[PDB]
Write a new protein. Structure first.
Lengths: 98, 98
């Protein structure tokens, strides 16, 4: 006894510290799991926001890109028009023929 | 023209960089959202593991704590037994009375 009292007490004090650390661990994981879920939630909404911001950025570039093409095709047509008017004057100066 | 060509080109190059950055942003959020979900998954399983490790730590302490109480109650009973035997000898030396 008394010697034994000192043991079954420091033993109590180790079993009690390990139980506290084991509570710490569960406590920490619950905090972690919770801030994660919050970052997740915040990221998803920041993603649909960025998604819309990108779809507009790319529909703008698509529509500038097609404007540029539509302009170059009109320049090309203009030169084919000039070619064509020139071939139709050679056709009308030839078609006489009287 | 040509002066204009230099502009509608550096303009193209800015619209194209902003569209790349906007893709970067969506790209980054998708990576983030994904590693989060993985940490979440890893934390939940590390939580049920820690949960079981704590329930055992606490059922051990509960059962050491009740052993200690059961021992102290048996020590107390032993002293009440001695009290009681002493009061029953005074009862039997008195009950004679003959």
């Amino acid at each position: 006894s008394m010697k034994f009292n000192i043991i079954r007490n420091e033993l109590h004090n180790i079993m009690n510290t390990q139980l506290k650390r084991a509570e710490s661990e569960v406590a920490a994981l619950n905090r972690r799991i919770q801030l994660l879920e919050e970052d997740l939630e915040r990221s998803e909404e920041r993603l649909g926001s960025a998604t819309a911001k990108l779809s507009e950025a790319s529909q703008a570039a698509d529509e500038s890109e097609r404007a540029r093409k539509i302009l170059e095709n009109r320049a090309l047509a203009d030169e084919e028009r000039m070619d064509a008017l020139e071939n139709q004057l050679k056709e009308a100066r030839f078609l006489a023929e009287e």
